[PDB]
Design a protein around this ligand. Structure first.
Ligand SMILES: [K+]
Length: 131
């Protein structure tokens, strides 16, 4: 069986979706291709990079990207991480499944908020893998 595709979408492909891609690559790497995008691109949040560094994952090489139609069409699962993404997610192909795993926006907050969200995302992806 060929690897499946999971697409994490958020508001600015800066924190939540970047950490989800980071965790996804490691946790789901054997059976999935992992991508992330945002309704807008704010670049990779510095605190999100620091947060992943604490768990020995480098996401400073990630890119902040807008939603790509080609990736959507080939996605097995699209996961929206916030209301903005969920409400503004472009129309998906009829056969593509979509789920909303909401996480708080750590933007403008202390280091600790990124640590908290980082780990809530980790748990969600770990559970997903064991479905
Ligand atoms: K990306």
């Amino acid at each position: 069986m060929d690897k499946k595709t999971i697409y994490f979408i958020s508001t600015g492909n800066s924190a939540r979706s970047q950490m989800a891609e980071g965790w996804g690559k490691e946790i789901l790497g054997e059976g999935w291709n992992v991508y992330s995008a945002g309704i807008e691109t704010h670049g990779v949040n510095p605190k999100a990079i620091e947060a992943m560094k604490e768990v020995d994952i480098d996401i400073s090489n990630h890119t902040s990207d807008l939603i790509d139609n080609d990736i959507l069409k080939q996605s097995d699962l699209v996961v929206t991480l916030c209301s903005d993404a969920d409400n503004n997610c472009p129309i998906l192909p009829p056969n593509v499944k979509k789920e909303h795993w909401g996480f708080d926006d750590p933007a403008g907050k202390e280091w600790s908020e990124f640590q908290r969200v980082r780990d809530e995302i980790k748990l969600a992806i770990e559970k997903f893998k064991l479905r």
